[PDB]
Design an enzyme around this catalytic site. Sequence first.
Site, PDB file in Angstrom:
ATOM      1  CG  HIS A 274     -46.772 -75.253  36.735  1.00  0.00           C
ATOM      2  ND1 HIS A 274     -46.502 -73.962  37.138  1.00  0.00           N
ATOM      3  CD2 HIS A 274     -48.080 -75.544  37.009  1.00  0.00           C
ATOM      4  CE1 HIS A 274     -47.612 -73.472  37.644  1.00  0.00           C
ATOM      5  NE2 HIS A 274     -48.667 -74.373  37.601  1.00  0.00           N
ATOM      6  CB  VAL A 300     -36.228 -57.753  39.739  1.00  0.00           C
ATOM      7  CG1 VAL A 300     -36.278 -59.164  40.316  1.00  0.00           C
ATOM      8  CG2 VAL A 300     -36.178 -57.776  38.251  1.00  0.00           C
TER       9      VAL A 300
END
Lengths: 324, 418
Positions: A274, A300
């Site tokens: 990306h 997380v």
Amino acid sequence: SKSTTLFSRHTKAIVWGMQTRAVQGMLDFDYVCSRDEPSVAAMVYPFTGDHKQKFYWGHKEILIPVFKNMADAMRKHPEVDVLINFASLRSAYDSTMETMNYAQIRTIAIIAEGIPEALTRKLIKKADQKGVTIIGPATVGGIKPGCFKIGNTGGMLDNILASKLYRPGSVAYVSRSGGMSNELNNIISRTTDGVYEGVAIGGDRYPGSTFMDHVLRYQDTPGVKMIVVLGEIGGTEEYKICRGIKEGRLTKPIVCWCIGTCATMFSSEVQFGHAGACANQASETAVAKNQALKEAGVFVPRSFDELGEIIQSVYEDLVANGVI
Amino acid sequence: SAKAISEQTGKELLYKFICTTSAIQNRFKYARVTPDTDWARLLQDHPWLLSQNLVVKPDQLIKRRGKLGLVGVNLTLDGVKSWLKPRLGQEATVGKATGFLKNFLIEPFVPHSQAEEFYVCIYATREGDYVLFHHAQKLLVGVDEKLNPEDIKKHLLVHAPEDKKEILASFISGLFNFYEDLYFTYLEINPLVVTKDGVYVLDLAAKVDATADYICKVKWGDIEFPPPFGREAYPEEAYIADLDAKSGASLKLTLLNPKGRIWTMVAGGGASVVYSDTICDLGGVNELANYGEYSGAPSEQQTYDYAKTILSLMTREKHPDGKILIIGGSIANFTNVAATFKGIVRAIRDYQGPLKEHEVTIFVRRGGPNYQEGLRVMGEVGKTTGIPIHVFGTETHMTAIVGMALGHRPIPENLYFQ
Ligand SMILES: Nc1ncnc2c1ncn2[C@@H]1O[C@H](COP(=O)(O)OP(=O)(O)O)[C@@H](O)[C@H]1O
Ligand SMILES: Nc1ncnc2c1ncn2[C@@H]1O[C@H](CO)[C@@H](O)[C@H]1O
Ligand SMILES: [Mg+2]
């Protein structure tokens, strides 16, 4: 950000580009979602004259008009408030600017990868001034189960069925990766009551809409009970989540994992696939973002491998206390 | 993505294309030296190397060269050659990267005082481009805003010496127009020197938005994007890059360790990074050969050409413990998995001989359009060739095959093809 709600089961779109497979895939999803009408009202394709394209609504063949000129498509379809732009990188800028001259359009998805950052910033400026939500560039799009899906998002019917994307659950998500958002569809459908809405913001340096733009929408959407974010190395967009929790703006449970933790172990900088996936300073790394999210109160996991497990745990606690 | 350019490339562009009233000195006065340089020929082309003393430094995207002893200042040509003897062609470690010092720039030494040194930087953000000046002042220039000399005087030059404001303002306005016209995203001149004789660009660091090649190629020319220090550039990388340029499909390849036993060929920007993450979370960072991905619905032939590059690169030298190939992916949204895996299978077939010799074991996990036929032809080529291939579908967690391949977990035959 801008609007809380972008799509509904009445949304109608124009598709820019000759993308018959994408459009048929949307119509297949529309049918199993029990929409009244196809989500694509018309296509714009300047390389042919006006004509009609054959599509299938269930087993019934139907016609969708294809227009040479965007002005004709807009005028004949005032109900349209979304444009999905499959223009190549060379003309995505001009066709998106043109779309924003039509006040009926409130959301634009920009598919193409490879648009210059400086052009995207100008789209972002025009879009912010007009209140238009941009999803992309460099994205597959997103999906709102029961309501509307952008382009190729979620693939063919067999995947829509397997991941229960024909009706909404309680989990919203936002991701940089298109491919990984279909993995989240799968994971969420197996661990929770399923996706309420998902968006892939794309991989570019300046996404038309950021993680926090969509997280705020989900915080303000009553059907959403929890939020999943798949972040990525590069930029500092994810720290806005820590801030929003700290400010009491974000109160629903948020699960987050940032990809790109391998970059910290390489002896030199690595540009990933990306365009925005490159850390320019220590805080842009996946490891730093994940640690800050954890300290701010985001759920997380230790690694992408434990993501499904933590999502299921948050989901079950929310059922236990009556929130879901 | 934004890509760094060499100091030489950036100065060449700046000398060619900047528009300023300011008298820029030493235009095009630079000479490039490598371990293969013909010094007689160099001096034929650059006789000014004898006209005044010199400065020499590597031009390989190394930051803080002065602090590392890697700028030789105020040298005769003979002093440059002597300074290069212990450096040119030597291995060097900068921070944690190691590579060869093999590309140097020589330029005229410019006598000047500390008070004649200036710092200027322009860098891009979402909200516009920030312009920095120090003799520290910083100005956001919005996306549709102009930057005229009077703007620079008002907002940046408040502390600059009065006799230098006009030339500084003209230069910085020219610099900013140049930055925009050539689609830079970062441009730093540290130091910029201004003496009674004019402006000198002593140092330059820069990044350009490489996606703007279709707009800028008339001015950029055959621009080069060097790898970071500590990596080489390889022809296979250039070959994949050429494929990536010819279609809307994304094909990327970055060689990390050409001799590593762990290779990947993963679909998708996100998943390719998660597999790499998981490989390193599991100890294999010193054996990970490559990062890359294919995505965007490449054809069977594009995927064959991609895969044969990988299989060639992992059959160059044997390894005592053989090798691992991870053929992975998320559940694709639109890539024809059957068509792409048929490309890969044909590559595997063509290389089945070498693949057996290097004791390659293959792990496959993938969903998406037509993936069941994709997984079948992978299982099929394994039996035809004798190569061990273990094939998984949507019923397997995406990264499970990494733990399988490194021995952390066993292979579950009860999930084959599912
Ligand atoms: N051509 C030159 N003439 C005079 N002094 C120079 C010249 N090039 C560099 N210097 C001096 O050497 C210092 C270090 O060189 P520079 O190219 O700025 O490398 P770096 O910023 O990587 O340390 C400069 O800041 C300047 O003080
Ligand atoms: N001074 C020199 N020493 C060695 N090779 C040189 C020299 N000048 C030009 N070349 C090489 O010749 C080629 C252009 O004819 C380039 O590849 C360049 O690197
Ligand atoms: Mg410097």
